[PDB]
Design a protein around this nucleic acid. Structure first.
Length: 46
DNA sequence: AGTAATCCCCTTGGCGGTTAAAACGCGGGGGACAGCGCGTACGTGCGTTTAAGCGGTGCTAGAGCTTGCTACGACCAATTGAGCGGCCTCGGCACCGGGATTCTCCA
């Protein structure tokens, strides 16, 4: 149905995953557990 | 027939002591609890199919109610012995002591 095809076409148009970010450094990778909470970050004050 | 003194009994309260149980101090250990990483196991979403739910049809078991009477328990009076209150004693269980065996912990 055309409505569902247009919906997927819009979602494809909105998608960032289809986009290569030429400005990104391909080498650098984070520590995957960098997402500490404020509670945990304040726990580094000690 | 009533109300108060008299007398039994059994519960509450106090005093003394004695000693066994509660309170207090202190070192350390190890168990509570916060922190981290992972990974697997539970919540989510989709397509599938399965049968629970509804509207409808058919039957007969058996729940529920009445009738009729006689077998079985309620009630009473006379009989008696099984079961309770009181007294006795001796033997089971505790309590102690002492030597023997076990278990625990640091080496």
């Amino acid at each position: 149905q055309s409505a569902q095809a247009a919906h997927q076409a819009l979602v494809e148009q909105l998608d960032l995953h289809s986009i290569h970010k030429t400005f990104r450094n391909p080498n650098w990778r984070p520590n995957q557990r960098r997402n500490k909470t404020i509670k945990a970050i304040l726990g580094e004050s000690q």
